[model samples]
Target: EGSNPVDLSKHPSGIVPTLQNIVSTVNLDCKLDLKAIALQARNAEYNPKRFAAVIMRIREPKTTALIFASGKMVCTGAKSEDFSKMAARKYARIVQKLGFPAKFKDFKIQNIVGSCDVKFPIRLEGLAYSHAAFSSYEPELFPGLIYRMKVPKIVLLIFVSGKIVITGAKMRDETYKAFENIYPVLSEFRKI
Candidate 1:
């Protein structure tokens, strides 16, 4: 019998490909009429009592937009940075068509969230005890351990099943760096 070969160079130590959801913000550059826009645009919902912004959704990029009266919009649910920008532009265009002078300005990614599996279970208790300053594990309240990295300022939710969720990054590189920094530490606690 022959065994299939695996590409170790593509993914070092079982780090999966970039699986991220980009959350970006854009300034429309003009105050928006939330009620009017909501009424005019399809797939828009506004309930002032519950939320100030008008929630809008588009199918192309599969993103959700939170349009506020202050001319600021938050578009989320994009898988990559480029897709996020495209989604934001589409949202601005929608508002522009609604009679608002929407300009795509100050577009920035506020957060990048990525998740992957290490392909090996982790010893949460041992890891938490060894890295008390950075790791916090409480299986009673949460099944995963919350590890906070100071340098990159990224937060990770690590599970016993070797699943990891990386968040709180303004740029994608920061997320990747945080993951690289923690991979070795996680490997130390890998379950046999």
Candidate 2:
């Protein structure tokens, strides 16, 4: 028999359960609520770092999670994934890169805010819409729009206070074109 072929298209859609596993793997007993986190911000004007502190902590002795403290974490950059095992491995790599020098067994994943594309719509019962584009059938999962595509892509906008506003995404091909078309002018926001 030959070696088994890897199926790259196979990816997990629901990550909330995996998030809990990541939390437990890190040995944290703290309550993990993505709902409470987003709600606290939606209700009032709260500080970003302050909000981040409530749910997150330094990955213990190693302190590998430095950049995320600034609240500019990207899924790819942080090595975090919708899956727990991947997140765990990502955490370990970060620790190594941070110069703290630790193995996977030594570090853990702290609080992370994440979302993934789903087949069903995300239902938002009473919340007002906050951003642009991408409709959803459900308000909770897709939030703020109608479900239009088969495999929807989700975009998460992160705030300084660690608050995130999730938005629907168009096809990846469209997104790439938009980015490519606009790549030259990002410096307008800052003094380049």
Candidate 3:
């Protein structure tokens, strides 16, 4: 039997929307003392006027952790799901070491941002006119066309030069699906 390595991150069309960032959240399950904790930890900042959370960062995963007083922690800037989880755990561990019972619970990947290049220019005017219900393009106000998908609940920012920025994907599979689903439409809108 012949065997071959599988690449799940690849798409059949040879264009995969690469994940730019993953945003996740985890509940610490206990109230936090923001002031003392920020003072105790290095690379932590707190400014009540600007924001109401302890912004802690670590270089290992290169993520910014927002620790709130209401037992909520938001982890951002991780490119992968595993990194997000790891960064969140590291944040919780740091709090635990700070003389607090920071339980890591309800960890969830809330949003994922992905980008892709179609390698061909597109006509935004035709696309917006054809799919007015789902596509919104206001060149006078914004540069990209905001295409909203109902089923996957993904918002795609489509530029004229075949660049796309996808957001609001709860799962990465949604990103791939959205890209594949829109490829045909994009082809039809080719600038040629």
Candidate 4:
């Protein structure tokens, strides 16, 4: 519902927020045998005593898949959107190979985390108070200010050291857009 004209993302501010990680999910569409998967697959383990889902790992994309009996799986540790999709397929295929008949459906990004450095310090006192509507500052308990961007539904943690962390992003563009949208407000309270 909102955005900005001064897109620091497209401009030469060079405040490119890199994707740190993404958590995606897919439905296998069939119940899985955790014990069978653990025993048959390499780099797969399930100790029902500790966890219900079988934790499966693959190195090429460096993502972990949590296979549950409900036929739903969560993929984590992908750095990009394409990689995230590929990871889900890889995981689904792994399950498929184990004779579980995994189906790659409803592949969606649950969360994408992006982090950036503004290259300058910030005055939390002024910014937090200035944007009280969207900010929650309690320096007593935490060092960073929690900023909630309601439109895009992203939550960013702003640190005085100029670090910005964006969470709750369903897409990469949302992450960058949210960061660029919030940059100027931060510029207003920038510390030299």
The candidate that achieves the highest lDDT relative to the unseen native structure: 3
Strongest candidate by TM-score: 3
Per-residue lDDT of model 4, residues 87-110, tens digit only: 899889878777877888888999
Residue 59 deviation, candidate 3, in Å? 0.9
Candidates in order have lDDT scores of: 0.88, 0.30, 0.92, 0.89
lDDT of 2 by residue, 20-84 (tens): 11221432222333333334432212245555522322333212222132223212223232344
Off by over 4 Å in 2: 1-23, 27-48, 52-82, 106-192
Q: Total backbone clashes of model 2? A: 18
Ten contiguous residues with the weakest lDDT in model 1: 3-12
- For candidate 3, the C-alpha RMSD (Å) to the true structure equals 2.0
Whole-model alpha-carbon lDDT for candidate 4: 0.89
lDDT of 1 by residue, 1-192 (tens): 664363445335646536468999999999888889989988899999999999999987999999999999999999989999999999999888888899999999999999978879999999999999988999888789999999799899999998899999887768777887898888999998
Which 10-residue window in model 3 sums to the lowest lDDT? 2-11
Tell me the spans in candidate 4 whose CA falls farther than 4 Å from its real position.
1-12
Query: What's each prediction's TM-score?
Result: 0.91, 0.20, 0.94, 0.92
Residue-wise C-alpha lDDT for candidate 3, range 1-192, written one tens digit per residue = 654354444565568788999999999999989999989999899997899999999998999999999989999999999999999999999999989999999999999999999989999999999999999999999898999998789999999999999899988889988887888899899999
